[PDB]
Design a binder for this molecule. Structure first.
Ligand SMILES: CCNC(=O)Oc1ccc(-c2csnn2)cc1
Length: 291
């Protein structure tokens, strides 16, 4: 799977909100482009003169993420974050010259991402009460991964002492994205666990935080909530469910070719962090079939 790389795998089956610190600093921002940020302003002006209804929005930038030594007390993860925008994304990660920018970042800063916006995404492995994960079919009319399979997520917009408010907004945003697209009531959802961070090598390495969320509704009940909103209540064009039993071997199915890179990231981390039992009981042959 060349189109996805794991930056972080969480310990303990996934980290809760109270175990994560963030450092939000202008030291964590994109570097100005070698020939100046004029190239970004040029791409933006051209795009608005074709689609004048488009609007910019602020985004969190991921610089790096450092895990504590395993088994330790106190905070287990530090996220170093900066600020970016949708406009900066269109002029760097989405640019035809994105690979040139990665090479120049390696040469100038020893950092392939130094000239890239790299907005932080969130995504969820969302499990039902009857032990299915939830999947969504992408519109064939949109610019990114048209017609591919996705999981619930998005790119959260800003608004350890500003740090803790930023971690709160990250965890909050994955619940809000599930309520907005799946049309589930907020009270049917568990507090998220962070499984890890995955990079999309088809979007010049922009990263998504991948979370596990449990729903108290069955697959049949989730389907009813999604459809009951009508075609205008969701950007996706269908919902479907795979038994958690069958997620273990998903990379060996014909479904794997239809998954967008950020959804591959969520399923890889779900398999490594929530699946893959460590103990004698869940490890026994009858409960963990070989091959
Ligand atoms: C940022 C919103 N995200 C969220 O709530 O989950 C989704 C999942 C998929 C799509 C989508 C876009 S085009 N075809 N599908 C939209 C939303």
């Amino acid at each position: 799977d060349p189109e996805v790389t794991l930056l972080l795998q969480c310990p303990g089956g996934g980290l809760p909100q109270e175990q994560i610190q963030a450092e939000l600093s202008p030291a964590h921002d994109r570097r100005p482009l070698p020939g100046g940020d004029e190239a970004i302003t040029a791409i933006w002006e051209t795009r608005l003169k074709a689609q004048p209804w488009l609007f910019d929005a602020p985004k969190f930038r991921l610089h790096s993420a450092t895990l504590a030594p395993i088994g330790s007390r106190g905070p287990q993860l530090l996220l170093r974050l900066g600020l970016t925008s949708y406009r900066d994304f269109l002029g760097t990660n989405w640019s035809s010259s994105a690979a040139w920018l990665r090479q120049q970042g390696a040469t100038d800063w020893g950092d392939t991402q130094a000239y890239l916006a790299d907005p932080l995404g969130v995504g969820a492995a969302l499990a039902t009460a009857d032990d299915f994960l939830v999947f969504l079919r992408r519109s064939r009319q949109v610019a990114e991964a048209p017609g591919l399979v996705d999981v619930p997520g998005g790119h959260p917009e800003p608004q350890d002492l500003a740090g803790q408010l930023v971690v709160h907004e990250l965890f909050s945003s994955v619940l809000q994205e599930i309520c907005d697209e799946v049309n589930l009531p907020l009270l049917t959802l568990s507090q998220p666990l962070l499984l890890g961070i995955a990079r999309n090598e088809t979007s010049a390495g922009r990263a998504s935080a991948e979370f596990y969320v449990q729903c108290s509704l069955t697959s049949e009940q989730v389907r009813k909530h999604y459809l009951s909103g009508g075609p205008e209540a969701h950007e996706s064009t269908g919902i479907f469910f795979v038994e958690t039993q069958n997620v273990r071997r998903l990379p060996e199915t014909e479904m794997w070719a239809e998954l967008c890179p950020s959804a591959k990231g969520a399923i890889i981390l779900y398999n490594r962090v929530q699946g893959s039992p460590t103990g004698a009981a869940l490890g026994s042959p009858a409960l963990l079939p070989p091959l």
